[PDB]
Enzyme design. Structure first.
Site, mmCIF file in Angstrom:
data_model
loop_
_atom_site.group_PDB
_atom_site.id
_atom_site.type_symbol
_atom_site.label_atom_id
_atom_site.label_comp_id
_atom_site.label_asym_id
_atom_site.label_seq_id
_atom_site.Cartn_x
_atom_site.Cartn_y
_atom_site.Cartn_z
ATOM 1 N N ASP A 29 7.575 0.395 -12.050
ATOM 2 C CA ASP A 29 7.266 1.804 -11.794
ATOM 3 C C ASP A 29 7.961 2.785 -12.738
ATOM 4 O OD1 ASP A 29 5.602 0.847 -9.783
ATOM 5 O OD2 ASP A 29 7.191 1.008 -8.256
ATOM 6 N N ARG A 46 15.493 -1.960 -5.219
ATOM 7 C CA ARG A 46 14.128 -2.063 -4.681
ATOM 8 C C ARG A 46 13.057 -1.914 -5.783
ATOM 9 N NH1 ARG A 46 16.067 2.897 -2.996
ATOM 10 N NH2 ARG A 46 15.150 4.443 -4.422
ATOM 11 N N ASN A 47 13.397 -1.329 -6.946
ATOM 12 C CA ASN A 47 12.445 -1.147 -8.050
ATOM 13 C C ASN A 47 12.659 -2.141 -9.196
ATOM 14 O OD1 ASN A 47 10.969 0.912 -6.735
ATOM 15 N ND2 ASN A 47 12.523 2.398 -7.315
ATOM 16 N N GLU A 101 0.835 -1.196 0.000
ATOM 17 C CA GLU A 101 0.000 0.000 0.000
ATOM 18 C C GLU A 101 0.867 1.243 0.000
ATOM 19 O OE1 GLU A 101 -3.400 -2.322 2.624
ATOM 20 O OE2 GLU A 101 -3.267 -0.157 3.020
ATOM 21 N N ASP A 143 14.147 6.719 -10.819
ATOM 22 C CA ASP A 143 14.251 6.018 -9.534
ATOM 23 C C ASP A 143 14.768 4.581 -9.690
ATOM 24 O OD1 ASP A 143 14.028 5.575 -6.717
ATOM 25 O OD2 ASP A 143 11.835 5.246 -6.802
HETATM 26 C C1 FGF Z 1 2.115 -11.868 -7.827
HETATM 27 O O1 FGF Z 1 0.719 -12.067 -7.853
HETATM 28 C C2 FGF Z 1 2.705 -12.235 -6.471
HETATM 29 N N1 FGF Z 1 3.593 -11.344 -6.002
HETATM 30 C C3 FGF Z 1 4.308 -11.446 -4.854
HETATM 31 C C4 FGF Z 1 4.059 -12.574 -4.031
HETATM 32 C C5 FGF Z 1 3.119 -13.517 -4.461
HETATM 33 C C6 FGF Z 1 2.409 -13.371 -5.675
HETATM 34 C C7 FGF Z 1 1.407 -14.453 -6.131
HETATM 35 N N2 FGF Z 1 1.675 -15.795 -5.604
HETATM 36 C C8 FGF Z 1 2.678 -16.656 -6.244
HETATM 37 C C9 FGF Z 1 3.265 -17.748 -5.307
HETATM 38 N N3 FGF Z 1 2.186 -18.447 -4.558
HETATM 39 C C10 FGF Z 1 2.715 -19.475 -3.626
HETATM 40 C C11 FGF Z 1 1.166 -17.582 -3.902
HETATM 41 C C12 FGF Z 1 0.945 -16.222 -4.523
HETATM 42 O O2 FGF Z 1 0.092 -15.530 -3.985
HETATM 43 C C13 FGF Z 1 4.798 -12.800 -2.709
HETATM 44 C C14 FGF Z 1 5.414 -11.468 -2.200
HETATM 45 C C15 FGF Z 1 6.151 -10.699 -3.344
HETATM 46 N N4 FGF Z 1 5.284 -10.418 -4.512
HETATM 47 C C16 FGF Z 1 5.438 -9.259 -5.259
HETATM 48 O O3 FGF Z 1 6.314 -8.454 -4.974
HETATM 49 N N5 FGF Z 1 4.662 -8.982 -6.359
HETATM 50 C C17 FGF Z 1 4.643 -7.840 -7.195
HETATM 51 C C18 FGF Z 1 4.963 -6.567 -6.711
HETATM 52 C C19 FGF Z 1 4.816 -5.460 -7.565
HETATM 53 N N6 FGF Z 1 5.129 -4.208 -7.152
HETATM 54 C C20 FGF Z 1 6.186 -3.940 -6.181
HETATM 55 C C21 FGF Z 1 5.659 -2.882 -5.196
HETATM 56 O O4 FGF Z 1 4.541 -3.483 -4.520
HETATM 57 C C22 FGF Z 1 3.726 -2.504 -3.847
HETATM 58 C C23 FGF Z 1 4.370 -5.674 -8.881
HETATM 59 C C24 FGF Z 1 4.230 -4.558 -9.766
HETATM 60 N N7 FGF Z 1 4.106 -3.644 -10.440
HETATM 61 C C25 FGF Z 1 4.067 -6.963 -9.333
HETATM 62 N N8 FGF Z 1 4.179 -8.001 -8.456
#
Ligand code: FGF
Length: 277
Positions: free
Chosen positions: A169, A155-156, A23, A151
Site C-alpha cells: 500500500d 500490519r502493512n 474488503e 502508514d
Molecule cells: C495470495 O494469493 C494469498 N494470500 C494470502 C493467503 C493465501 C494466498 C494464496 N494461497 C497460497 C497458499 N495456498 C495453500 C492457498 C492459497 O490460496 C492466505 C491469507 C493471507 N494472504 C494474504 O494476505 N495475501 C495478500 C494480501 C495483500 N494485501 C493485504 C491487505 O489485504 C486486504 C496483498 C497485497 N497487496 C497481497 N497478498
C-alpha cells in the site's frame, strides 16, 4: 475507458479469481491464479493477488485504483515491496495484479510464532533482524523513488510463502496515531523522516513479536508523554544496539533521525554479526 499498456497488459482469460483476501470501503484484494505470468514458462500457474473495485464503487474510486496502478509502474520493482505483475484494463472491470503474500501481514505472522508468554513462563534472533533489514531496504528503495509511505506499520508489511518481507500500500492516493511522527500528528507534515519515526515503531513491533505500541498508555496521554521526551522502553531480550536504533528514529527533530540508508547499513552490520552468534 483505459489506455492499453503493452508493458503491463495481461490476458483476462489467463486470470482466475478466487476467494477474497480483504474488503475495504470501495476496494478489495482477492486471491487469483495466473497462467503465463512469467513469459519464460507461458503455461505455468502462479498464485497472485488482485486489487479491484467493489460493486458499490464510483468513478472517484476507479481514478484512485488507476492512480495506484500508475504509481506502481512509475516506482518500479524491488524485492521488498508488493510488486505490480500485470493489468486487465480491456473488455471488463479493472484488475490490478500484484504479488501474493501467502503468510499474511507481519504483525499476525509474528504473533502466531510467539514463545510462551508471562502467563505460562520459533523465530530465531537473526530471522527477526533480517525482517527489519528487509523492511529498511524496501523503504530505502521507496524513498529513492520519491515515495513517502505515511502508514508504515507491521500490519502493512506482508510475508510471502518464502518468508520475504514486502511493504504494501505504498502506491495509495480510528487513526494510526501510535506510528505517527509528532510533526505528522500535530502539524500534518509527512516527509521521509516521519516514515523513519514509523520504522522505529515497526522495529519495536518486530522485537516484541507483534506487540501493541505504548502498552497500557491511553491514546489521549501519548502526545503529552512524547512532548516530555518519554519513549517506549527496550523490549524484553532486545539487544541495546537495536534499541539504540529505535531511539534514534524517535528523536523529536526530523533532521536528527537516521536516514533509511544508515538504517539499512546499521541493520546489515547487526544481521551479519548475529548470523554467527
Ligand atoms: C495470495 O494469493 C494469498 N494470500 C494470502 C493467503 C493465501 C494466498 C494464496 N494461497 C497460497 C497458499 N495456498 C495453500 C492457498 C492459497 O490460496 C492466505 C491469507 C493471507 N494472504 C494474504 O494476505 N495475501 C495478500 C494480501 C495483500 N494485501 C493485504 C491487505 O489485504 C486486504 C496483498 C497485497 N497487496 C497481497 N497478498
Amino acid at each position: 475507458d483505459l489506455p492499453l499498456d503493452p508493458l503491463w497488459e495481461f490476458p483476462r482469460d489467463r486470470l482466475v479469481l478466487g476467494k477474497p483476501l480483504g474488503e475495504g470501503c470501495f476496494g478489495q484484494v482477492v486471491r487469483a491464479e495466473a497462467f503465463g505470468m512469467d513469459p519464460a514458462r507461458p503455461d505455468q500457474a502462479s498464485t497472485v493477488a488482485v486489487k479491484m473495485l467493489k460493486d458499490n464503487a464510483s468513478d472517484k474510486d476507479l481514478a484512485d485504483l488507476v492512480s495506484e496502478m500508475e504509481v506502481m509502474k512509475l516506482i518500479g520493482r524491488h524485492k521488498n515491496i508488493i510488486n505490480l505483475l500485470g493489468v486487465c484494463t480491456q473488455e471488463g472491470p479493472l484488475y490490478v495484479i500484484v504479488e501474493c503474500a501467502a503468510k499474511g501481514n507481519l504483525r499476525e505472522f509474528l504473533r502466531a510464532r510467539r514463545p510462551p508468554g508471562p502467563d505460562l513462563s520459533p523465530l530465531s534472533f537473526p530471522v527477526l533482524v533480517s525482517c527489519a533489514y528487509q523492511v529498511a531496504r524496501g523503504m530505502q528503495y521507496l524513498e529513492s523513488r520519491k515515495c513517502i509511505h505515511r502508514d508504515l506499520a507491521a500490519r502493512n508489511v506482508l510475508v510471502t510463502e518464502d518468508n520475504v518481507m514486502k511493504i504494501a500500500d505504498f502506491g495509495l492516493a480510528r487513526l494510526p496515531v501510535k506510528w505517527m511522527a509528532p510533526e505528522a500528528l500535530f502539524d500534518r507534515v509527512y516527509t521521509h523522516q516521519s516514515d523513519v519515526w514509523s520504522f522505529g515503531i515497526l522495529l519495536w513491533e518486530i522485537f516484541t513479536l507483534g506487540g501493541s505500541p505504548y502498552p497500557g498508555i491511553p491514546v489521549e496521554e501519548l502526545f503529552s508523554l512524547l512532548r516530555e521526551g518519554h519513549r517506549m522502553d527496550r523490549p524484553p531480550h532486545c539487544p541495546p544496539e537495536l534499541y539504540g536504533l529505535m531511539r534514534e528514529c524517535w528523536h523529536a527533530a526530523p533532521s536528527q533521525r537516521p536516514t533509511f540508508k544508515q538504517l539499512v547499513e546499521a541493520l546489515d552490520k547487526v544481521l551479519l554479526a548475529v548470523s554467527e552468534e
